[PDB]
């Protein structure tokens, strides 16, 4: 009820080639294919694009063919994830850390997000409880004075 | 709007000292702009005000304002107003109340609830009823509100006493009757006299100040002393016109005033409890004070009303007088000898004089 689940939607799959790797942790530059239409010449031009794909377990090396999927937003400039390796480079696929399935990656977001809310409800209650105690002490010092000053008057009427 | 408060008529040296004190520190600062008033009382600007003290263009020669220690320099207003009040012994002295009470109204000094009743007693016993009726008229300036049930009962007493002082002569009785109505008109219409204190006292009596049997009996007294003299026709037009009011006010007082209820039983028993609300009536010295003319009125009214052929009113009014006379007699024995109450009642009701 209070937890927000990720979309968990499957987008298209693109086949590309890793251009760079090992420069930044859990990130590689993949080059996919594209094509743009020139309305003036009525001609299609090749429009190759290079994105920053999310390699969770650092299982990609420059030169391997991979299949990526968009919609997986991990950072400001990272909107793509690695789905699987089409053709490895250097070493076989069995000698690299496994690529987590999209379900495992999504579960990490839900688990991490759900845990984040559990910390807030505790921090909010403790913050509200630790403050109500101080506000409850002002009543004490203010109540003893009234009870000490109001009973005095009442003690001279009976 | 109004001229700056100033006192330039003091018969005694002590009176001037009490007014000059309040005037130069409690009244005058009320004429300065708000920012300058705060500066006067600030310790940080003490040295600055010494070199170049604030000034005021007051009818010529200017005043000066140095630093005023709010705790030590400021004088006790209730005490000074007392010293000035007691010292007042000449008409020129009492004329300062118009400026004094105006200054406190500007300073927002919540004066003692009973103070008004005191000014009306000391000023009227000296023969200055007009100064009171003049301030009671100019309440927008002086702040002489008729909020207390004692002030109204005290003011109406001296009004009648002045008429009775000269055997209830027609020239003065017409003037007194004019004043009693000018007050009952203010209590009803004028809003300056309505405050939280009044609403509380009107709730304890269940009779507004303008429909209180104790006060309506004052008007009925003078009206009863006008038909008595006559009951040339240019004067008879008034006599025949006064008989209509007498029978009118009489039947109005009998309706409000319950049956066989004296002055101490008229209002709710819970009214005489609080000392700030209608407790003065308990003391026999003060009861006979406000029960002298109120009793004589019913007696004379029941007599005149009886000659015109009004059986019911004749019996009704006598019922009240019988109830007040019985209670009044109890006060004569309880009151201490030599008290003002025992004297006035002896001179009005007893007629010993």
């Amino acid at each position: 009820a209070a937890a927000t689940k990720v979309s968990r939607k499957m987008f298209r799959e693109l086949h590309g080639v890793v251009v760079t790797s090992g420069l930044i942790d859990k990130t590689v530059k993949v080059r996919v294919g594209g094509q743009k239409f020139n309305k003036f010449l009525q001609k299609h031009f090749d429009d190759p694009k290079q994105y920053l794909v999310h390699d969770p377990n650092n299982s990609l090396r420059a030169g391997d063919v991979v299949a990526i999927m968009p919609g997986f937003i991990t950072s400001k400039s990272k909107r793509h994830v690695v789905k699987h390796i089409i053709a490895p480079a250097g070493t076989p696929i069995e000698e690299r850390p496994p690529i987590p399935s999209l379900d495992e990656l999504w579960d990490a977001k839900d688990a991490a997000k759900a845990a984040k809310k559990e910390r807030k409800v505790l921090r909010e209650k403790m913050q509200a409880a630790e403050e109500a105690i101080e506000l409850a002490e002002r009543m004490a010092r203010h109540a003893v004075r009234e009870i000490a000053m109001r009973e005095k008057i009442i003690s001279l009427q009976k | 709007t109004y001229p700056v408060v100033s006192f330039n008529k003091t018969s005694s040296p002590e009176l001037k000292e009490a007014l000059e004190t309040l005037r130069e520190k409690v009244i005058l600062p009320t004429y300065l702009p708000p920012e300058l008033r705060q500066k006067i009382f600030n310790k940080k600007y003490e040295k600055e005000l010494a070199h170049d003290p604030v000034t005021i263009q007051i009818d010529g020669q200017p005043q000066r304002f140095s630093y005023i220690n709010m705790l030590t320099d400021m004088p006790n207003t209730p005490k000074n107003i007392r010293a000035a009040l007691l010292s007042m012994k000449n008409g020129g002295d009492f004329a300062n109340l118009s400026g004094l009470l105006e200054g406190m109204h500007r300073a927002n000094r919540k004066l003692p609830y009973w103070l008004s009743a005191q000014i009306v007693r000391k000023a009227c016993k000296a023969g200055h009823l007009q100064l009171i009726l003049n301030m009671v008229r100019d309440v927008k300036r002086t702040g002489f509100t008729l909020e207390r049930h004692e002030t109204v009962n005290e003011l109406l007493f001296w009004i009648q006493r002045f008429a009775w002082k000269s055997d209830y002569s027609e020239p003065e009785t017409r003037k007194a009757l004019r004043e009693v109505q000018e007050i009952l008109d203010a209590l009803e219409g004028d809003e300056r006299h309505m405050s939280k204190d009044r609403k509380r006292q009107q709730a304890l009596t269940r009779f507004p100040y303008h429909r209180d049997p104790q006060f309506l009996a004052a008007r009925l007294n003078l009206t009863a002393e006008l038909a008595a003299r006559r009951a040339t026709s240019e004067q008879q037009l008034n006599s025949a016109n006064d008989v209509k009011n007498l029978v009118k006010y009489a039947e109005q007082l009998v309706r409000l005033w319950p049956a066989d209820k004296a002055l101490l039983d008229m209002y709710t028993d819970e009214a005489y409890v609080a000392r700030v609300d209608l407790r003065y009536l308990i003391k026999p010295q003060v009861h006979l004070r406000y029960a002298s003319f109120t009793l004589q009125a019913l007696k004379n009214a029941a007599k005149i009303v009886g000659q015109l052929g009004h059986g019911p009113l004749a019996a009704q009014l006598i019922n009240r007088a019988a109830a007040v006379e019985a209670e009044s007699q109890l006060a004569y024995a309880k009151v201490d000898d030599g008290m003002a109450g025992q004297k006035i009642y002896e001179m009005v009701v007893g007629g010993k004089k």
Binding site: - | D185, G189, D190, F207, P208, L256
Partner: protein, 193 residues
């Protein structure tokens, strides 16, 4: 169809009507020979007589239709009017033993309020009793304690046209600036002589 409403005691003739609604309409009082001519003539017939400008003619046609509907202005429901001057008085009642009700009633100047009966004791709308002996209401000049009168003043019913204070909200700082220059030039001039 163009019904004519009967004249009221407060508006007996046309010269009175055109005087109340103001806007300099008392100039064309002679154009209307009778009281029916006012409520019978049309726009075209009011234009040939010389009822100009168009604002005054349209303003008259409005108050003309406003009179048929009994939507009079102030003091339009009076009955005891004498030569264009009415008198107001207070009628005190007894709503309760501790209260009084005061209503501003219109009676002849001589008769007393208590003497008048309910039928002829009219209660004027728009005037109220302040205090105990004050008659508050537009165009209520006091004569005695609890007595006032309504003199038929020009423009008593008129809808005042708005006016510009000192040349409007746009040309205000300029008009006052130029007045000061003219004022200063005439104080300095007298100094020369």
């Amino acid at each position: 169809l163009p019904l004519i409403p009967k004249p009221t005691p407060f508006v007996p003739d046309v010269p009175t009507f055109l005087t109340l609604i103001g806007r300099d309409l008392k100039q064309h009082a002679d154009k209307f020979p009778t009281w029916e001519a006012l409520f019978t003539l049309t726009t075209d017939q009011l234009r040939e007589l010389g009822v100009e400008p168009p604002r005054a003619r349209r303003y008259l046609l409005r108050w003309r239709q406003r009179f048929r509907e009994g939507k009079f202005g102030i003091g339009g429901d009076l009955k005891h009017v004498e030569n264009g001057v009415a008198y107001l008085k207070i009628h005190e009642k007894e709503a309760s033993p501790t209260r009084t009700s005061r209503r501003v009633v219109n009676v002849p100047a001589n008769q007393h309020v208590e003497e008048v009966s309910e039928g002829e004791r009219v209660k004027v709308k728009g005037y109220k009793v302040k205090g105990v002996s004050t008659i508050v209401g537009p165009y209520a000049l006091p004569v005695q304690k609890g007595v006032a009168k309504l003199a038929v003043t020009e423009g008593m019913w008129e809808d005042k046209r708005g006016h510009k204070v000192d040349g409007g909200e746009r040309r205000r700082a300029e008009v006052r600036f130029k007045r000061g220059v003219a004022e200063r030039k005439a104080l300095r001039e007298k100094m020369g002589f």
